[PDB]
């Protein structure tokens, strides 16, 4: 069970293979440009990372 039944097929790619790099949350992630945050964490840190509201 620990290592005998699982790990017998490619399943390393699902949504559970990702999580927000700030809060380990798997919902609403941002993959674009690779900063890998959720919506809200990115909104919090956008000023610091370098994204500024101009449009």
């Amino acid at each position: 069970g620990h290592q005998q039944l699982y790990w017998s097929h490619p399943r390393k790619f699902g949504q559970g293979s990702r999580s927000c790099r700030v809060c380990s949350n798997r919902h609403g992630l941002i993959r674009k440009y690779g900063l890998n945050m959720c919506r809200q964490c990115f909104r919090q840190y956008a000023k610091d990372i370098g994204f500024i509201k101009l449009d």
Partner: protein, 97 residues
């Protein structure tokens, strides 16, 4: 899941000789490249650390999915006197000046 003792002894020795452990560990997978050579499941280390905190000997900080520990004189003395590892090994938290 396996519960050994000498693997934890090696983990304790590396913690003493470093201050913090550098080995990403996943509960789901038995081996990770950083986890390897120190084959103890993450769960073991963090449960032992939570028991340690409930007891209390070491300092810690948390940031962005990462732990950052600090081993002071209390932890050095405790690892010295429990596991009867003699002080011929010098801690790495007091290097330089």
């Amino acid at each position: 899941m396996l519960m050994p003792k000498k693997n934890r002894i090696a983990i304790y020795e590396l913690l003493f000789k470093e201050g913090v452990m550098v080995a990403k560990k996943d509960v789901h997978m038995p081996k990770h490249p950083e986890l390897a050579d120190k084959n103890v499941p993450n769960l073991h280390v963090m449960k032992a650390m939570q028991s340690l905190k409930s007891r209390g000997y070491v300092k810690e900080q948390f940031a962005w999915r990462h732990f950052y520990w600090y081993l002071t004189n209390e932890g050095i003395q405790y690892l010295r006197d429990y596991l009867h590892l003699p002080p011929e090994i010098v801690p790495a938290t007091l290097r330089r000046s």
